[PDB]
C-alpha cells in the first residue's frame, strides 16, 4: 500500500512508563484526566472506567466521590414504578456525552468518535500514536491532498483525512498544578492518561514481573547446577573394551 494509506508511523517518544522498571507518572495521569474531562469528553466516552478506578491513581476517594455526586444516574423505579434519577456513586461508570451511536454521528458530521477506554491498545503505536495524532495537524494539508468535506488532514491517521479536528491549542486547559498547558504538554498528559485507562494494571504488572524475573532467574541458575550435578555420573562415565 502507499504510505498515505498506512499513515505516517509515529515517532518513539520516551514515555516515563517505557522501561521495564518504570511506572506511569501519576502526576501526568492526573493532568491527563483533566484534559480528558475538559476537552475530549465533549465527544468521546470512557465507558470502561468507573469513578472508583481513579481513586488512588489520580484522585483521592473524596475527590472522586465529588465527581460522581455531581452527575445524575438512572435509579431503580419508585414505588409507583415511575423512573427516577440518583446522584452518582464510586461504583458508577464515567458517563458518555451521547446517548447512542446515532446521536454521536449526528453531532460529528457522520463520524463516530470511538470510546477511548481501549484506544491506546487498539491502535499500532499506543501512546505514541495518540500523541502524534493530537499534535500532528499541519497548518495546511500537503499540496495536492483532496480532503472529503468535514475531514481534516492528519498524516498519522491512515488515509490522512480524519473526522476529528485539531482540538488542543495552547491554554484550552488551565492545569490545577500550575504546569504550562501547551499543546505538547496536554497531548503528552492525555496520552499518558489514556494509556493508563487502557492498561490500569500496568504498574502492578511490572512490579510483579520484576519479582518473577528475579526468582525465575535464580531458579534457572540453580536448575543448571542441579542438572550438572545429577548428570555428572553419566557425563564422566568411562569404558574399557576388551574384545572377547
Amino acid at each position: 500500500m502507499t504510505a498515505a494509506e498506512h499513515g505516517l508511523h509515529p515517532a518513539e517518544y520516551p514515555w516515563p512508563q517505557n522501561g521495564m522498571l518504570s511506572t506511569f507518572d501519576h502526576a501526568s495521569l492526573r493532568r491527563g484526566y483533566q484534559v480528558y474531562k475538559e476537552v475530549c469528553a465533549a465527544c468521546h466516552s470512557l465507558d470502561r472506567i468507573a469513578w472508583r478506578n481513579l481513586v488512588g491513581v489520580t484522585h483521592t476517594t473524596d475527590e472522586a466521590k465529588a465527581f460522581a455526586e455531581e452527575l445524575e444516574y438512572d435509579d431503580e423505579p419508585d414505588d409507583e414504578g415511575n423512573p427516577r434519577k440518583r446522584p452518582g456513586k464510586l461504583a458508577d461508570y464515567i458517563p458518555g456525552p451521547y446517548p447512542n451511536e446515532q446521536a454521536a454521528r449526528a453531532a460529528n458530521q457522520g463520524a463516530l468518535p470511538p470510546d477511548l477506554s481501549l484506544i491506546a491498545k487498539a491502535r499500532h503505536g499506543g501512546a505514541d500514536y495518540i500523541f502524534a495524532l493530537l499534535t500532528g495537524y499541519p497548518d495546511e494539508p500537503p499540496a495536492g491532498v483532496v480532503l472529503a468535506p468535514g475531514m481534516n488532514y492528519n498524516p498519522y491517521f491512515p488515509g490522512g483525512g480524519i473526522g476529528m479536528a485539531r482540538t488542543l491549542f495552547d491554554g484550552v486547559v488551565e492545569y490545577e498544578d500550575g504546569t504550562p498547558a501547551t499543546t505538547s504538554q496536554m497531548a503528552k498528559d492525555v496520552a499518558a492518561f489514556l494509556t493508563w485507562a487502557a492498561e490500569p494494571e500496568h504498574d502492578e504488572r511490572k512490579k510483579l514481573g520484576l519479582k518473577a524475573i528475579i526468582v525465575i532467574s535464580a531458579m534457572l541458575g540453580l536448575s543448571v547446577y542441579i542438572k550438572k550435578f545429577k548428570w555428572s555420573p553419566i557425563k564422566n562415565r568411562k569404558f574399557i573394551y576388551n574384545p572377547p
Binding site: 553419566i234 557425563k235 562415565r237 569404558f239 573394551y241 574384545p243 572377547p244
Partner: protein, 124 residues
C-alpha cells in the same frame, strides 16, 4: 529403501567408467563431511535396525562382530551425550570402515524378495 536397492544401484555406477569417475570422488567427500567416522562409527552401524529383516541380519552376525558393534554404539552414544568427538584410535580410519553387515542383510533380503516373487508364481 532396501539395502538390496542401494547396493544394486551402486554397482551400476561403479561399472560405468564415466559414472564412477564423477561419483566416486563425490561420495568420498560426502562421507568425509558426513562425519560419522568422528564418532567412531562404521558406516554400517548407522543402518536402521528396527525392521524384521535387519533384526534377522544382526542375529546372523558372528559373535565377535556383534560384540564390537555394541561397543561402537555405546562409545558413540557417550560421545554424543558429552558433545565430544572421538580422538586418536577411536576415530574410524577409512581402512577400518568395512561393510561388516552388508553381506548379512543382502542374504536376508534376497530370501525375503524371493519369497515375495514365488508367492506370486503362475504355473504356465
Amino acid at each position: 529403501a532396501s539395502i538390496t536397492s542401494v547396493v544394486k544401484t551402486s554397482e551400476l555406477i561403479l561399472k560405468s567408467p564415466l559414472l564412477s569417475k564423477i561419483v566416486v570422488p563425490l561420495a568420498k567427500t560426502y562421507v568425509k563431511f558426513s562425519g560419522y567416522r568422528q564418532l567412531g562409527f562404521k558406516m554400517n552401524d548407522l543402518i536402521i535396525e528396527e525392521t524384521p529383516n535387519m533384526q534377522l541380519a544382526l542375529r546372523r552376525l558372528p559373535p565377535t562382530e556383534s560384540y564390537d558393534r555394541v561397543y561402537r554404539l555405546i562409545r558413540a552414544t557417550q560421545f554424543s551425550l558429552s558433545h565430544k568427538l572421538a580422538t586418536g584410535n577411536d576415530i574410524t580410519k577409512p581402512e577400518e570402515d568395512d561393510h561388516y553387515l552388508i553381506p548379512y542383510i543382502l542374504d536376508v533380503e534376497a530370501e525375503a524378495f524371493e519369497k515375495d516373487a514365488l508367492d506370486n508364481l503362475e504355473v504356465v
